[PDB]
Design an enzyme around this catalytic site. Structure first.
Site, mmCIF file in Angstrom:
data_model
loop_
_atom_site.group_PDB
_atom_site.id
_atom_site.type_symbol
_atom_site.label_atom_id
_atom_site.label_comp_id
_atom_site.label_asym_id
_atom_site.label_seq_id
_atom_site.Cartn_x
_atom_site.Cartn_y
_atom_site.Cartn_z
ATOM 1 N N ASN A 22 4.567 -5.283 5.732
ATOM 2 C CA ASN A 22 3.640 -6.270 6.129
ATOM 3 C C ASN A 22 4.247 -7.534 6.492
ATOM 4 O O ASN A 22 3.574 -8.669 6.429
ATOM 5 C CB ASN A 22 2.630 -6.617 5.206
ATOM 6 N N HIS A 60 0.284 5.231 5.881
ATOM 7 C CA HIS A 60 -0.297 5.768 4.674
ATOM 8 C C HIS A 60 0.100 7.089 4.329
ATOM 9 O O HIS A 60 -0.603 7.918 4.961
ATOM 10 C CB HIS A 60 -1.500 5.177 4.271
ATOM 11 N N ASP A 90 -3.146 7.455 9.721
ATOM 12 C CA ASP A 90 -2.369 6.540 10.468
ATOM 13 C C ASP A 90 -0.815 6.817 10.268
ATOM 14 O O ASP A 90 -0.523 7.912 9.522
ATOM 15 C CB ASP A 90 -2.687 5.218 9.851
ATOM 16 N N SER A 95 0.668 -1.346 -0.119
ATOM 17 C CA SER A 95 0.193 0.037 -0.209
ATOM 18 C C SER A 95 0.710 1.194 -0.046
ATOM 19 O O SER A 95 0.239 2.330 -0.195
ATOM 20 C CB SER A 95 -0.851 -0.045 1.200
#
Ligand SMILES: *[C@@H]1O[C@H](CO)[C@@H](O[C@@H]2O[C@H](CO)[C@@H](O[C@@H]3O[C@H](CO[C@@H]4O[C@H](CO[C@H]5O[C@H](CO)[C@@H](O)[C@H](O)[C@@H]5O)[C@@H](O)[C@H](O[C@H]5O[C@H](CO)[C@@H](O)[C@H](O)[C@@H]5O)[C@@H]4O)[C@@H](O)[C@H](O)[C@@H]3O)[C@H](O)[C@H]2NC(C)=O)[C@H](O)[C@H]1NC(C)=O
Ligand SMILES: *[C@@H]1O[C@H](CO)[C@@H](O)[C@H](O)[C@H]1NC(C)=O
EC number: 3.1.1.86
Length: 233
Positions: A74, A195, A192, A9
């Site tokens: 991740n 991002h 957050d 992302s």
């Protein structure tokens, strides 16, 4: 010439949703080559491999094309409560096994997944560039904190073992964030600490290009300009 992007992302079109975007969306303006953004939100080196996404790029990539791979965000976590993203611990040929999504999955280390992908592409004549992950907001607490994850060194190790190029995207982004200051960098993280907003994504893409020019990475050949703020290192 086509440039394929593989990431999460922080690189993908539409970022992590809610008005955020990924840095891969700001590269095309600065390259004289076609950019194909294959980054997908929520993927790790493990899940991107399992979903056949490195394989898909391998099918279409041809001699002379570039492939930029950037994972790490991740890839951590605990295998004890398998989320399907966490890689096996280690830097080499270690293998982990975990039941996930109805399969007793063979899980490799983060460097192994990147090395295997680099080998597929390199054998076809593509130029592979492994890039370290971008940092989470380093000013989240009001003061600047430089704290690289283990995946930054792992990406460097992987490039060395696979014999491909490495770009330290992490250091270049953190260097510019440190100089931009608290108020500005916090404005790049609207929902957050991971991002980026469209402006933050642009700054992150420029930092990747600054790193390419400073280190003499092969991608230098298709860059349309070298006018980016910051300094080498
Ligand atoms: C580093 O930079 C940051 C960003 O520039 C600085 O933080 C800002 O500082 C300014 C000036 O002091 C703050 O502006 C004031 O805001 C108050 C209102 O109080 C605040 O409300 C904010 C909005 O809340 C809503 O929106 C949020 C975001 O979508 C959401 O999360 C909320 O649920 C809500 O819907 C809120 O963001 C802010 O939170 C912060 O402060 C809390 C302190 O108790 C803390 O718990 C929390 O973690 C946050 O730190 C607070 O509730 C107005 O009354 C006033 O007029 C003025 O406009 C601005 O809120 C701050 N923004 C942020 C993101 O913190 C910071 O000072 C700099 N750090 C240092 C060390 O210099
Ligand atoms: C998964 O496979 C490994 C190796 O074949 C085996 O040792 C392990 O017990 C298997 N996991 C489960 C839950 O059966």
């Amino acid at each position: 010439t086509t440039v394929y992007l593989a990431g999460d992302s922080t690189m993908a079109k539409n970022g992590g949703g809610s008005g955020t975007n990924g840095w891969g969306e700001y590269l095309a303006s600065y390259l004289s080559a076609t950019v194909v953004n294959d980054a997908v939100a929520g993927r790790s080196a493990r899940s991107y491999t399992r979903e056949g996404r490195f394989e898909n790029i391998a099918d279409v990539v041809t001699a002379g094309d570039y492939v930029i791979v950037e994972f790490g965000h991740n890839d951590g976590g605990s295998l004890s409560t398998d989320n399907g993203r966490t890689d096996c611990s280690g830097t080499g040929a270690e293998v982990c096994y975990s039941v996930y999504d109805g399969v007793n999955e063979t899980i490799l280390t983060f460097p192994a997944y990147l090395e295997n992908a680099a080998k597929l592409f390199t054998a076809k004549g593509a130029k592979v560039i492994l890039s370290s992950q971008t940092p989470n907001n380093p000013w989240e607490t009001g003061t600047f904190v430089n704290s690289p994850t283990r995946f930054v060194e792992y990406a460097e190790l992987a490039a060395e073992v696979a014999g491909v190029e490495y770009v330290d995207h992490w250091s270049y982004v953190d260097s510019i964030y440190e100089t931009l200051g608290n108020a500005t960098v916090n404005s790049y993280f609207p929902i957050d600490h991971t991002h980026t907003s469209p402006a933050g994504a642009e700054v992150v893409a420029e930092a990747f290009l600054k790193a390419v020019v400073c280190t003499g990475t092969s991608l230098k050949s298709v860059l349309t300009t070298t006018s980016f703020e910051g300094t080498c290192l």
